[PDB]
């Protein structure tokens, strides 16, 4: 592929504790959902709920330091896992911990 | 209130769909295939654009055309008629870029 | 004239208190510099500029040491100085400023 | 670390400049003209495989996409010189 860009940057709050597991190849994987407030206001300020996935030390740092309600920033890519009986999620290659 | 930024460059998988709201707001939708580099080879992102940007999409973009998007990631999740939670993730394109 | 994208997103700490000025037409304009840490140089100094309501909020809520997030565009204002040498200016025109300690 | 992400799409103003470091690492610099929504002229830098691709694929006026980070750098002139550049992790361009 030529001329392909895919970049996402989000800051939000985890809706619940992150879920850490390990893949068959032993790679740690931490998942979590990020509530990101919208810019505009309707009628009430709605939010968007974005599923994120992290890998290896990134996933391990997430599991140890981030909890429900923690503020976190992610930098990564949009990835899809559509199947037939669509899924979209953020593959976060960097996670910033905005709280101590 | 919180950071939310998406930038993509890919190629439309089909011709864009255009429609005007009864009040005259143009809304155009399309799906961007973005190639990666055993694992998945590409991702397919649904995009939404409004007003002049949407009229540009409909007049200049077709299946296979190269297009770039700059916007935010939003969700429109809902509960279907069968009590099942359905997840909808889309890119609200604030700016659409294309050749010519 | 077609196919152009310009997007910057940063999180950093203000190295100094923001400076608030007003244009000849009365528009508020606030400037500030962010220290953006890296993963021998430890952080990059990036000059930011904001307008109107965003500038008012920056002036009221952000001070030296405040953590801030910016989303905007890269802009350049290069010129020729008194001695005839070109000097290059790069700054972030922030469309939105997130205050991470309100 | 903190968030620092830049994405640009523009046109090279000049042919890219290919240099090498003492240990043989390729380094390519170029300037992207990005029209405002009048244009901005942003200096970019890339390394190694990406640098080699820039050198033998991009020329004056070529369209190029950049994904990277906003950084500052030091390099003596051929006086101390300080520059603000986009460090490109990936450089995208149109199939030759």
Curated annotation (Swiss-Prot), chain A:
Keywords, comma-separated and alphabetical: Cytoplasm, DNA damage, DNA recombination, DNA repair, DNA replication, DNA-binding, Phosphoprotein
GO CC term, one of those recorded: cytoplasm
Subunit structure: Homotetramer. Interacts with proteins involved in DNA metabolism such as PriA, RecQ, RecG, RecS, DnaE, RarA, RecJ, RecO, SbcC, RecD2 (formerly YrrC), XseA and Ung. Interacts with RecQ via its 10 C-terminal residues. Interacts with RecD2.
Full-protein residues shown: 1 to 105 of 172
Domain notes: The C-terminus is required for interaction with a number of interacting proteins. The C-terminus acts as a hub to recruit proteins to active chromosomal forks.
Name by which UniProt lists this protein: Single-stranded DNA-binding protein A
Originating gene: ssbA
Induction summary: Strongly expressed during exponential growth, decreases 2-4-fold in stationary phase, part of the rpsF-ssbA-rpsR and the ychF-rpsF-ssbA-rpsR operons. The operon is induced by DNA damage by mitomycin C.
Subcellular location field: Cytoplasm, Nucleoid
Any one GO molecular function term: single-stranded DNA binding
Originating species: Bacillus subtilis (strain 168)
Domain SSB per the UniProt entry, residue ranges: 4-99
Gene Ontology BP, a term: DNA replication
Organism phylogeny: Bacteria, Bacillati, Bacillota, Bacilli, Bacillales
Function: Plays an important role in DNA replication, recombination and repair. Binds to single-stranded (ss)DNA and to an array of partner proteins to recruit them to their sites of action during DNA metabolism. Associates with oriC, this requires DnaA. SsbA binding to ssDNA prevents DnaB and DnaD individually from binding to DNA. Has a 20-fold higher affinity for ssDNA than SsbB; SsbA and DprA activate the homologous DNA strand exchange function of RecA-ATP. Enhances the activity of 3'-5' DNA helicase RecQ.
Modification(s) after translation: Phosphorylated by YwqD, which increases ssDNA affinity; dephosphorylated by YwqE.
Curated annotation (Swiss-Prot), chain D:
Sites of Phosphotyrosine modification: 75
Induction line: Strongly expressed during exponential growth, decreases 2-4-fold in stationary phase, part of the rpsF-ssbA-rpsR and the ychF-rpsF-ssbA-rpsR operons. The operon is induced by DNA damage by mitomycin C.
Keyword DNA-binding in record: yes
Post-translational modification: Phosphorylated by YwqD, which increases ssDNA affinity; dephosphorylated by YwqE.
Cellular component, GO, one term: nucleoid
Main location: cytoplasm
Domain SSB: 2-95
Compartments where located: Cytoplasm, Nucleoid
Keywords: Cytoplasm, DNA damage, DNA recombination, DNA repair, DNA replication, DNA-binding, Phosphoprotein
Gene Ontology BP terms: DNA recombination; DNA repair; DNA replication
GO terms for MF: enzyme activator activity; single-stranded DNA binding
Oligomeric form and interacting partners: Homotetramer. Interacts with proteins involved in DNA metabolism such as PriA, RecQ, RecG, RecS, DnaE, RarA, RecJ, RecO, SbcC, RecD2 (formerly YrrC), XseA and Ung. Interacts with RecQ via its 10 C-terminal residues. Interacts with RecD2.
UniProt free text on domains: The C-terminus is required for interaction with a number of interacting proteins. The C-terminus acts as a hub to recruit proteins to active chromosomal forks.
Function comment: Plays an important role in DNA replication, recombination and repair. Binds to single-stranded (ss)DNA and to an array of partner proteins to recruit them to their sites of action during DNA metabolism. Associates with oriC, this requires DnaA. SsbA binding to ssDNA prevents DnaB and DnaD individually from binding to DNA. Has a 20-fold higher affinity for ssDNA than SsbB; SsbA and DprA activate the homologous DNA strand exchange function of RecA-ATP. Enhances the activity of 3'-5' DNA helicase RecQ.
Name of the featured protein: Single-stranded DNA-binding protein A
UniProt source species: Bacillus subtilis (strain 168)
Shown chain mapped onto the complete sequence: 1 to 105 of 172
